[PDB]
């Protein structure tokens, strides 16, 4: 049950003026595409706080990648879901190398020990699904799954929360589908033909409700097992599988490249009013 919002004073939305005229802000299946200017964060914060929303954030830090945790976590403290309950899940082979980062109230961190970089990247699907299945259901409302070699530079908040979301890969948001680096071999479960595809989503940032995230990760894990048995490895590993899944199961929001940017590689185009979550060289 959802109680009433309180009285709020904010600018009237005007029907005959778009928030953004330079970009697509809704998909053909009526999922919002989240850009700066499309949302009033005060309204969204109220809606989600009134539900006492808890957001889980998963991150893998294996071998040398433990080096990225300090900046990742400190910047998440400044920019990720501030004001809401947050549970970080750090999956690592070196629990003792996890930095002691100071957390704000209502925020906690669990270190989960786990066991080729391609396999490290791909295997995230198995651990998120069939090993941590029960824990997440009991502890959080939404799961957000991200790469660790990143930093937050601006607000990433409840505007992203929805049953299932993907993020536009920063190298492909302006590309034709034939240029998308989908798996193109019919022998792979990740196969997408040249005449299919909505977007190219990045493997580095997806999420949704616990239920939908566990469905996605279970499906990708199973698909990857089939490929392994058939002696084939998708061109972009779990990102390829993620793309196949989100083609056949449309996300309920799509995040713009504000949410996964690489300034060194791609600069700062006019279309991006904010760079929120960015690659660390
Ligand atoms: O040795 C490794 C290789 C990969 N990863 C994890 O897998 C993610 C994806 O790999 P990577 O960031 O190297 O992919 P890229 O961003 O270069 O495409 C990383 O963010 C880590 O979370 C890791 O922890 N240790
Ligand atoms: Mn990465």
149 is written with which tokens?
A: 């070699």
Distance of CA 8 to the CA centre of its chain: 30
Radius of gyration of the chain (CA): 19
Q: How far is the CA of 117 from the centre of ligand 1 (A)?
A: 7
Q: Detail the residues annotated as belonging to a binding site for Mn(2+).
A: 147, 149
Query: Is-contact 37 275, C-beta < 8 A?
Result: no
Active site residue 239: yes
**Which method resolved this structure?**
X-ray
For the CA of 149, the closest atom of ligand 1 is: 20
CATH number of the structural domain spanning residue 261 = 3.90.550.10
DSSP per residue, 193-241 = -TT--S--B-TTEEEEEHHHHHHHHHHHHHHHHHHHHTT---TTHHHHH
b/e sequence 122-133, b meaning 16+ C-beta within 10 Å: bbbbbbbbeebe
DSSP string covering the chain, please?
--PPPPP---PPP-TTS-S-SSS--B-TTS-BEE-TTS--HHHHHHHHHTTT-EEEEEEEE-GGGGGGHHHHHHHHHHHBSTTSEEEEEEEES-GGGS------TTEEEEEEE---HHHHHHTHHHIIIIITHHHHHHH-SEEEEE-SSEEE-S-B-GGG-SSEEEEB-TTTTTS-GGGS-----TTSTT---TT--S--B-TTEEEEEHHHHHHHHHHHHHHHHHHHHTT---TTHHHHHHHHHHHHS--SEEE-GGGSB-HHHH---TT-S---EEE--
- Structural domains in the chain (count): 1
Pairing of strands 33-34, 253-255: parallel
Contact assessment for residue 97 and residue 66, using Cβ atoms and an 8 Å cutoff:
yes
Residue 74 sits in which domain range? 1-281
Resolution, given in Å to one decimal, reads 1.5
User: Which tokens in the block code for residue 5?
Assistant: 């919002």
Nearest to 182 by CA among 169, 124, 222: 169
Q: Give the span between the Cα atoms of 121 and 123, in whole angstroms.
A: 6
Looking from the CA of residue 150, the nearest atom of ligand 1 is 20
Ligand nearest to the CA of 63: 1
Report the candidate in 237, 19, 202, 11 with the shortest Cα–Cα distance to residue 119.
Answer: 237
Q: Which residues are annotated as a binding site?
A: 60-62, 65, 147-149, 169, 181, 239, 262
Pocket of ligand 1 (CB under 6 A): 60-63, 65, 117, 120-121, 147-149, 204
């Amino acid at each position: 049950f959802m109680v009433s919002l309180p009285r709020m004073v904010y600018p009237q939305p005007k029907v005959l003026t778009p928030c953004r005229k330079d970009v697509l802000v809704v998909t053909p299946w009526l999922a919002p595409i989240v850009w700066e200017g499309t949302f009033n964060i005060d309204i969204l914060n109220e809606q989600f706080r009134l539900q006492n929303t808890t957001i889980g954030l998963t991150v893998f830090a294996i071998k040398k990648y433990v080096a990225f945790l300090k900046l990742f976590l400190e910047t998440a403290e400044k920019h990720f879901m501030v004001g809401h309950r947050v549970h970080y899940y750090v999956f690592t082979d070196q629990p003792a190398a996890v930095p002691r980062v100071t957390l704000g109230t209502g925020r906690q961190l669990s270190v989960l020990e786990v066991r080729r970089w391609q396999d490290v990247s791909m295997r995230r699907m198995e651990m998120i699904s069939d090993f941590c299945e029960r824990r997440f259901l009991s502890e959080v409302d939404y799961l957000v799954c991200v790469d660790v070699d990143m930093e937050f530079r601006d607000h990433v908040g409840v505007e992203i929360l929805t049953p299932l979301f993907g993020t536009l890969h920063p190298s492909f948001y302006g590309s034709s589908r034939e240029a998308f680096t989908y798996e193109r071999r019919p022998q792979s479960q990740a196969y997408i033909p040249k005449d299919e595809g909505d977007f190219y989503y990045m493997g580095a940032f997806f999420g949704g409700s616990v239920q939908e995230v566990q469905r996605l990760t279970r499906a990708c894990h199973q698909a990857m097992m089939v490929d392994q048995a058939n002696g084939i490895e998708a061109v972009w590993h779990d990102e390829s599988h993620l793309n196949k899944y989100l083609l056949r199961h449309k996300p309920t929001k799509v995040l713009s490249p504000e949410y996964l940017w690489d300034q060194q590689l791609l600069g700062w185009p006019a279309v991006l009013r904010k760079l929120r979550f960015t690659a660390v060289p």
